[PDB]
Amino acid sequence: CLATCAVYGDGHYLTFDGQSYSFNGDCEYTLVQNHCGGKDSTQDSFRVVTENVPCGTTGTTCSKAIKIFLGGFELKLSHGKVEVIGTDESQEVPYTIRQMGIYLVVDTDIGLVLLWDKKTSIFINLSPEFKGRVCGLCGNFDDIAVNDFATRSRSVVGDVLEFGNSWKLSPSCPDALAPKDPCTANPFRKSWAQKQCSILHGPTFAACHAHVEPARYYEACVNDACACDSGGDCECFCTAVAAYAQACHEVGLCVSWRTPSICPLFCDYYNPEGQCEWHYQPCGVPCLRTCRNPRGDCLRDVRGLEGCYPKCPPEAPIFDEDKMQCVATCP
Amino acid sequence: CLATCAVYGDGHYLTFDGQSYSFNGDCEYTLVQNHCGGKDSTQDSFRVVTENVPCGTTGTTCSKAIKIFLGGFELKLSHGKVEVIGTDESQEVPYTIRQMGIYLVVDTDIGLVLLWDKKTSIFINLSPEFKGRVCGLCGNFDDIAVNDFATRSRSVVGDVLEFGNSWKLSPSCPDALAPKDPCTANPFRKSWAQKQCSILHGPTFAACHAHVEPARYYEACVNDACACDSGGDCECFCTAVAAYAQACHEVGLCVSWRTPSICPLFCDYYNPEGQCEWHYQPCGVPCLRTCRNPRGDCLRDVRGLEGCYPKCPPEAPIFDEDKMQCVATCP
Ligand SMILES: [Ca+2]
Ligand SMILES: [Ca+2]
Numbered sequence: 001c002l003a004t005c006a007v008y009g010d011g012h013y014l015t016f017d018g019q020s021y022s023f024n025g026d027c028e029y030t031l032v033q034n035h036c037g038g039k040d041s042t043q044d045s046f047r048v049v050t051e052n053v054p055c056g057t058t059g060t061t062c063s064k065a066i067k068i069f070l071g072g073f074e075l076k077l078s079h080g081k082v083e084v085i086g087t088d089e090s091q092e093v094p095y096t097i098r099q100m101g102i103y104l105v106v107d108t109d110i111g112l113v114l115l116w117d118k119k120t121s122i123f124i125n126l127s128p129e130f131k132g133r134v135c136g137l138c139g140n141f142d143d144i145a146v147n148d149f150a151t152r153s154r155s156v157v158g159d160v161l162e163f164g165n166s167w168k169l170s171p172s173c174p175d176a177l178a179p180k181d182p183c184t185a186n187p188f189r190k191s192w193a194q195k196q197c198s199i200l201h202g203p204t205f206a207a208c209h210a211h212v213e214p215a216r217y218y219e220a221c222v223n224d225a226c227a228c229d230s231g232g233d234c235e236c237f238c239t240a241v242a243a244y245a246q247a248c249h250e251v252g253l254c255v256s257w258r259t260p261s262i263c264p265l266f267c268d269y270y271n272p273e274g275q276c277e278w279h280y281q282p283c284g285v286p287c288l289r290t291c292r293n294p295r296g297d298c299l300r301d302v303r304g305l306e307g308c309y310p311k312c313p314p315e316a317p318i319f320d321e322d323k324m325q326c327v328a329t330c331p
Numbered sequence: 332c333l334a335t336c337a338v339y340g341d342g343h344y345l346t347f348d349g350q351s352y353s354f355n356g357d358c359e360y361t362l363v364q365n366h367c368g369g370k371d372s373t374q375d376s377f378r379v380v381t382e383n384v385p386c387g388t389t390g391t392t393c394s395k396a397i398k399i400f401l402g403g404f405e406l407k408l409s410h411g412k413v414e415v416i417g418t419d420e421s422q423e424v425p426y427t428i429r430q431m432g433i434y435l436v437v438d439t440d441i442g443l444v445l446l447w448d449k450k451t452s453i454f455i456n457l458s459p460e461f462k463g464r465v466c467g468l469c470g471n472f473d474d475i476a477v478n479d480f481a482t483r484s485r486s487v488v489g490d491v492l493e494f495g496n497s498w499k500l501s502p503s504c505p506d507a508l509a510p511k512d513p514c515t516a517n518p519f520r521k522s523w524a525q526k527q528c529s530i531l532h533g534p535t536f537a538a539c540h541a542h543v544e545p546a547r548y549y550e551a552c553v554n555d556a557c558a559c560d561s562g563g564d565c566e567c568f569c570t571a572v573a574a575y576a577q578a579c580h581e582v583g584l585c586v587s588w589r590t591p592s593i594c595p596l597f598c599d600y601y602n603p604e605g606q607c608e609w610h611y612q613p614c615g616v617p618c619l620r621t622c623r624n625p626r627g628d629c630l631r632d633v634r635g636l637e638g639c640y641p642k643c644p645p646e647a648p649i650f651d652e653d654k655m656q657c658v659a660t661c662p
Contacts, residue, residue, distance in 0.1 A: 231523030
């Protein structure tokens, strides 16, 4: 149906065609770039880049800020907030900002959306119309998992490190090098890392085990827990688990894995005094009535979004959508 | 009114009279022991001991299990569960187990209670009738903060290390030594530790700043965050903050400090499908109606207990207290 490019953790990548690899660097890297070369096929050119900074002590790097360039508009996503810099006094704003669950969903009219958790990871969804016309770190959308190493010169190179380094934006950035083993570097956290990441092989994800192989995700969890030693390994572990959770949710079946002792969420914080409407939905609501989305309309386009969601009462069931409450009606 | 002996974090102690110090060891240590020596004043003798294990890599130790001895009854508190070993087929069971908020409150008829968070810390409350007749790691209850160093031989010694080592249970245990500086040992976590523990000096605890000095608690938070490097520093930071939170709550005023990004609780997990009764009370309910506590009775003896609490509807407002729901009536 729709392909997905997933970037999460400490340089873990997943191409549109299904190829997976690992690469770490400290520079600006372009994930998806439209209109490769000078060929402009009467379409707008969109460019998304990520900023990586060295997090930890072994040498691993994680994404910190994401910049979006399209139609002369520049958007910045840092510290969990959206800041617009590039402003054009013409045409029409093509991006819409939505807050569904724990993700920061943005939508564009061209057919490209983003799923940002505001911490480390980012999910990219592309329409099938852009097949065979997109190049970048996510690989060419050609449904072939063996030719996803175009090093910006239309030349497939098996060197993953060279392929990653060939996509650097600033020429002055230092060249990336091969990483070490975080578990070997810090052998006093291996037992804790294994005990925490053993939940992937537990009976909770029995349904996911029959569709998605968890070996790669388990190894990623172990590596992240061994490397996330700069303070806040709980967030790294939660993101590593949520990556596989969203991957399994994309298939179509949802599984509840959260636990008050394992990555908890405070859904009651948004509830006002004397009221209770917010609830936790592991599978995410299909469609809800908001100010911009009337009751008669229901856009079932995105699936697999977990987080706190409100349950408006029958009286005043329209979500006001700007100050987190349900209202009778809005203009 | 009532004195309190608090043990939390990595060997942080607070005597009944108000003296505070720090000591780390790896053995069984007696906190409060009744009837010091051979003097039996026609009262039952209670003895509470704690088990410390080396947690981390610098050399700090934290409590893991707590054993209670009274009336020939032995109780064990490990892995967040209560296990009874010492059983006597005579007299009557003098202990009651209650689950209020996040603490595991146990009550005894003699006048001694315990507040266990099931993770690291333990709070002891003693009746004023036991003044000047209790010796142990909590010091003699004599309202004097300068003679709280009785090293089991009725001799006050200024050496905190010697005073702590003189209370070891097993003679074969190794003698404790002076600890090092965790922040100096791991200088790559100082910035993160300071950024996390700066919440104590923020405007949230402005009311607490006028009653309890937060310098000692801030130093304890910094040291714990620098030392808790074995995996799970979030739990260590949460316990360090909750210690000062409970200390301020004991004064009489309550302040809400929890945040969905700072030590969250999943109060919605206990809510059944289609119902919403559980809520988070920073100050704790004064009294609630349960199966063993009718509506006409309200025991207002303990204050300062935060956590998830249920709000039963007017219909069937009696808490069933054994399977987490509200029922109309129970025998
Ligand atoms: Ca390809
Ligand atoms: Ca004393």
